[PDB]
């Protein structure tokens with residue numbers, strides 16, 4: 001369905017891109033989105049899909065809009081927008097100055113010191129999962145590793161029972177690549193409903209887990225309230241349970257298709273941190289937006305107050321104006337330019353945990369199962385949304401070529 005074109009939007013700027021089901025999804029999701037950056041396509045277009053909204057196609061515009069919170073606000077309505085409902089996550093649905101006090105507390109639960117503490121449990125789980133798969137000579141990567149690895153580490157961090165995974169995983173899916181069984185407002189409320197009693201419990205009997213830290217936290221010397229804690233934890237669950245999961249499948253799919261890139265990392269393990277960054281650029285997967293606070297002309301385009309604008313984080317690094325041969329994976333790339341973890345006051349606070357999980361995966365995997373391929377005849381399908389992903393990734397390998405550790 002295409003929403004009627006608003007009177008202020010010029011017809012020459014129309015480009016009906018569907019972020020939840022892009023026209024060329026079969027070429028790969030990043031490729032489908034990259035069609036927006038072609039010379040024939042304007043730097044800023046309006047799509048009538050999903051209620052109608054702007055889409056900044058170039059990294060320069062995407063970066064600029066994320067820096068200007070005064071015009072481009074994070075008090076985001078959904079896409080498609082829902083009547084009387086909008087995002088209220090903390091600190092993600094807030095604009096500075098208000099947003100700032102909340103980042104510190106969030107940073108305290110998923111930040112660097114926390115990642116350092118998790119280090120050995122992270123290494124242990126990756127190794128444990130990979131060793132059990134190794135003798136099989138085959139696996140369904142998405143469900144066998146991509147999902148359990150990051151999710152179990154997060155549940156551990158959050159002090160949540162692993163039995164709650166199917167439920168939470170279903171809900172976070174609805175917040176990124178919804179199948180239509182729930183609205184964003186219902187999915188979000190269910191996440192909140194799950195958290196409420198948990199926050200109360202830990203507020204009274206605190207632990208060292210992420211939920212306890214938020215529940216008993218302080219924002220700028222003031223105690224966070226139950227509701228603010230609920231809204232922060234809700235956001236953390238989405239980030240912690242969904243984002244890395246999908247990214248890992250893009251990376252493993254690529255590696256399974258490029259023996260040359262596998263061998264490179266095998267021979268030069270010191271290049272893994274660099275490979276992680278490069279893969280983060282090439283397989284960037286998030287795309288959310290902002291809302292205009294007033295009538296404003298941006299790069300020759302008249303934007304109206306209340307207009308929604310999607311600023312795809314995934315697009316910046318794929319822009320040939322930012323990186324030469326952007327669709328090519330080059331571990332030795334000199335200046336890996338991207339906005340995969342965001343840009344502006346809302347830079348991803350879980351970026352350190354993400355990188356650590358990717359780097360460990362790459363080392364542990366290539367060290368035990370160095371040679372692997374995609375199952376013969378398999379058609380890998382990608383799904384587009386606020387956080388794009390891989391439907392399934394059947395891999396195969398000869399156990400005789402594996403190294404047991």
Ligand code: HEM
Nearest residue numbers: 091092239240243244286313340341342346348349350354
């Ligand atoms: C590869 C994985 C990840 C990617 C690519 C990613 C990407 C992003 C992006 C693009 C944003 C900014 C959204 C905006 O500006 O509206 C963001 C925000 C955030 N992410 Fe992630 N993320 C990842 C993993 C995680 C993980 C594991 C967590 C852990 C809980 C997490 C926690 C957060 C938080 C707390 C923020 C909010 C920052 C704020 O609003 O000030 N992310 N992430």
